Design a protein around this ligand. Structure first.
Ligand code: TB3
Ligand code: CL
Length: 135
């Protein structure tokens, strides 16, 4: 077993969002995509198999998936179609995902707080908080 498995593995459903439209604007998402993606109610599925972690985001807007090893950079196509260089690490008990593209950077952190899984997305002073609970 592991901290990672105990904290994060399973199926999570979105329960609240704040500032997500503004975060998407900062990242460069266009109007129509922001409206439909903002209306989404995703499930987040996190699994571990050996050293490989998989995170899936599933909704009526889009289904996406990433698999990775902690600390090892990979190329990712995001839901809004950015081509980014991604690295995910465990910093204390927080899963930290950094995306780099076009001289820009954004960070997505996932942390447990009580029964919830809190997702914080930060771009240049703009933070969005998305709260998930177990499905
Ligand atoms: O998975 C989350 O809750 C966290 C982040 C997230 O949803 N990101 C995202 C989704 C769809 C589009 Br379009 C653009 C972005 Cl930046
Ligand atoms: Cl967080």
């Amino acid at each position: 077993g592991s901290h990672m498995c105990d904290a994060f593995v399973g199926t999570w459903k979105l329960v609240s969002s704040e500032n997500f439209d503004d975060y998407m604007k900062e990242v460069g998402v266009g109007f129509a995509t922001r409206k439909v993606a903002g209306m989404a109610k995703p499930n987040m599925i996190i699994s571990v198999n050996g050293d490989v972690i998989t995170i899936k985001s599933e909704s009526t807007f889009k289904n996406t998936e990433i698999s990775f090893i902690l600390g090892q950079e990979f190329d990712e196509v995001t839901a809004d179609d950015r081509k980014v260089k991604s690295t995910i690490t465990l910093d204390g008990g927080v899963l930290v995902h950094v995306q780099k593209w076009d001289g820009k950077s954004t960070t997505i952190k996932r942390k447990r707080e009580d029964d919830k899984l809190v997702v914080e997305c930060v771009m240049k002073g703009v933070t969005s908080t998305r709260v998930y609970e177990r499905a």
